[PDB]
Homo-oligomer: 307 residues x 4
């Protein structure tokens, strides 16, 4: 059987080979606790240590499964999608119900994540998220409902495949460049560029925006209204920010659909970057990484058009 | 025919009786430009003037249609749902495509909004949003896609009815108290309590939260991760805030599903309020209004359980 | 504690495998029939409806375990025929009860909570699945395998369940339960109604065979807004003019088949099904045919229930 | 500018009513047939496929105007039979071209942009509607009246259109166009395949009539994961054992009908349709039957296309 490494970032989602013994019949599992934290507290340090671990141990194993909380799983998955250089399957998985709760979802989630990680056909598709019998790509996947076990969905382009009876039918694969095809290399980095997110809505204070500028943040992501629009006070602070060196990326609070370039706002005029289908938290991820390569908004836009 | 008043808050969404003449065959339309602004700039002053106008003119007409931009329509609609005391239909409508663009959606949107406003069966259901042949309640309706004409949907409980050939079949009506059944009365108010929204994600700065506290904001709404969870730095600032008088409401960045009380966080312990199915921008609306009645988080929670 | 009766129609969906039930209700159970839901039939429907109506005053609410294949059919039939205003809640499982992360146990727990909540009464026959309370009319099966498959695709759910509490924010407008004019206590059988499908180059043979067998009604799973392939139209038009009740529904999973849109229904005596999908339409047409054979009266029924 | 040919099969969906087309392509048009899409048939399919394959080297891409009722059927049939790798894009309108806010004009503009974009080639036959580029296999009609009805309910769309530009982020894995073993140039007719529906108490009469008429294949719109009402099962089992190709699909709008799950397919010679809904399954079974009558070979086809 294939040997799959399980990297845990927190508690157990099932309760591992003893908690879900059926696992030892499809893979050879070793487990390492890499960090232990709730995902609402996920952070840069954790991201860096994970990417490095996966990159160092790529040849010690046939695949990876990462147990992680659901709240920020979608951010971690995209970070790794951009930084892992192991074309072998890296599959993330979590659980929406506590492991001791009735009809706990963890056990079967874990099983299906190991199934996915172990299938050769899963290789070379970038980092994946596996939940609710579905194989989801790290870029587009996002949490759609606060409590539903079916919460994870790729709301713009769809899943990569479905899992029935330990088998996967892949009918899709992502087009946006990832893993070995990106120029990102966090292997020597101990920190990441500071990027914050500000929200837009009626009568929005500019204060949040101004705090980030005061603190010399490297980038700021705007969760805009509609097609990335900005409340005027926020538009003014961000315009300013962009002229004094803070990268500014326009995304949207609207859960699906792209924030398009030169549509609602003149990005070229202000030196802003439109995030495409990257929601705010995902846009933060690429902006941070783009900032380790360049600070030219034109080049940041190009990065946003390709990753 | 019934006489319907169209209150415009910005430009035309069609191009009114001359731009969509079919209108004069279903209603008697008068139009007033109440303000002229892009909805990304929507604000308290506009909300107050609209509520008052609708309340003053309730007996001058059989119904209201409000033309408004799409970016914050969902916020205005809920504000009015809470403050209008005219049980007559108040129907909001906007357009996702410019009026001069091919297959402009405005014309037929406007027509269907007038159809809705004119149907007696539409009365007593609170403030409505009409878009894409659908009648949506002001509380649950939200913008789901950045550009799609079908963007407005009530993502937790569904629409109230569908519109085919100028006819409506209502199969639902909202249960949460609105209009005349709320204690909110902005008729004498010239300002609203200050409420801001802060976003949570991996490695979230507490700075935004702290700016609002520094400025003596009355309330703060957290767009949390998952079931309203908070990044630790943000959790600490907000906990503090709540002890020194800032109302704190936990909502979620996740587009559907409720942020439940005493689930992921101990709201009772910290004096926080869980927003139920109110997304961040909608939660801001009720929190602002709840703040004109009380500052006791227990009572704010009760308000969040009933409106 | 509330008395709740679990009426089972098949195999179990849990396994007490859910001891936590003692915390919310006094539970007793009866195996009413035992079949795979894909073989659900008129006899089961009649007996179920009669059992609930007969037993209404012995318990505080009912939970009905049922396979997922035709849960949406039974739920609507019960929605139209139950004369008990106490909560009737149907429940199933998408995963075998012995499979890992089986959904049955929590689904069942949630159904008893729903059946026992006093706020659940007077909302008609309910279906509880994946933490959601769904009305029997609009509820349909949306995905072949996903635990979250049950959704009310047109009008949404009535309420969500978290930690054993329901936040109801909706109730259906279409009349059901004791508000309908249907009465199963007098029926040992139901009018014959079949369903035919429409698609490119569709044979009229299925429709023809139904008519030849003297079927009381036929529901057309049409294309788009209830349209019909030419040959199927031709056949059903004659049928409707000669006494067969004919209802236009649609193969399209959401949205209504409207009146006076695509087809001139009055001209032929056809009835438009509204938001009722073909299998749901069938439930209502069978029932309407126990009350009348008149197309206009049947359309009225379809506009009301 | 690119040469794009618009092949019309019905009434127009715009009305130049869209002069803005001159900005993106040199357009010429031919009325290939003229019918309501609810009467779409084998003859139209054959002629369309032949026309595109014959005319492939005269233009840069094709746009096909087609009614919405069976757009998803034609699109898949073309997906399986077009041997031209240039973009073929189907397009419709959900509102009358003269109604207010008609969708046809912008839909058409978007289809020509798609047909003319060089990045659109080699993705198979496409359907463009509501600013979205959708593959012909997974695309289905989701709502009876909404302009946004066309969606790829299982795997999503290939790309979105904004301001005349497409951000393609997906392409289908299932082989299509010249990769299939089908060849319509040799066909004046297609094998007879009908579709029967399953639901509670389903009559076996439709299935029986199809078999009696010597149908080459039958697709079952089953319940849940492709299951069958007892009587329909019994009939199709005999049919499959005696030479009728039988494909299990599902009435359920999303998700696959899987192999070796609910039914022992090999035991009877049934074929599981995968994510192919009944009308789509029919398209592929008709085509498979022009190549073989062997169930295992047909299942292989269903696992590949
Ligand atoms: Zn990727
Ligand atoms: Zn309301
Ligand atoms: Zn009902
Ligand atoms: Zn009643
Ligand atoms: Zn294809
Ligand atoms: Zn090829």
């Amino acid at each position: 059987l294939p040997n799959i490494t399980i990297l845990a970032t927190g508690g157990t989602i099932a309760g591992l080979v003893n908690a879900v013994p059926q696992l030892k019949d499809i893979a050879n599992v070793k487990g390492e606790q890499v960090v232990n934290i709730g995902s609402q507290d996920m952070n840069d340090n954790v991201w860096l240590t994970l990417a490095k671990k996966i990159n160092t141990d790529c040849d010690k194993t046939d695949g990876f499964v990462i147990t992680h909380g659901t709240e920020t799983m979608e951010e971690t998955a995209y970070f790794l999608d951009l930084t892992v250089k192991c074309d072998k399957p890296v599959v993330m998985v979590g659980a929406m119900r506590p492991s001791t709760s009735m009809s706990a979802d963890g056990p079967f989630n874990l099983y299906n994540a190991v199934v996915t990680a172990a299938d050769k056909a899963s290789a070379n598709r970038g980092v994946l998220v596996v939940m609710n019998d579905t194989v989801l790509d790290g870029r587009d996947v996002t949490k759609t409902n606060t409590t539903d076990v079916a919460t994870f969905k790729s709301v713009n382009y769809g899943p990569l495949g479905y899992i029935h009876n330990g088998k996967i039918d892949y009918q899709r694969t992502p087009a946006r460049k990832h893993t070995s095809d990106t120029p990102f290399d966090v292997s020597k980095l101990n920190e990441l560029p500071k990027v914050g997110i500000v929200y837009n809505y009626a009568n929005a204070s500019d204060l949040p925006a101004k705090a980030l500028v005061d603190a010399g943040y490297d980038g700021i992501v705007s969760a805009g209204v509609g097609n990335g629009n900005l409340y005027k006070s926020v538009f003014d602070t961000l315009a300013t920010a962009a002229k004094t060196g803070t990268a500014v990326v326009r995304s949207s609070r609207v859960p699906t659909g792209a924030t398009t370039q030169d549509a609602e706002v003149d990005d070229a005029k202000y030196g802003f970057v439109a995030s495409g289908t990257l929601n705010p938290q995902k846009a933060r991820v690429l902006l941070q990484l783009a900032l380790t390569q360049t600070k030219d908004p034109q080049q940041i836009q190009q990065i946003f058009n390709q990753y």
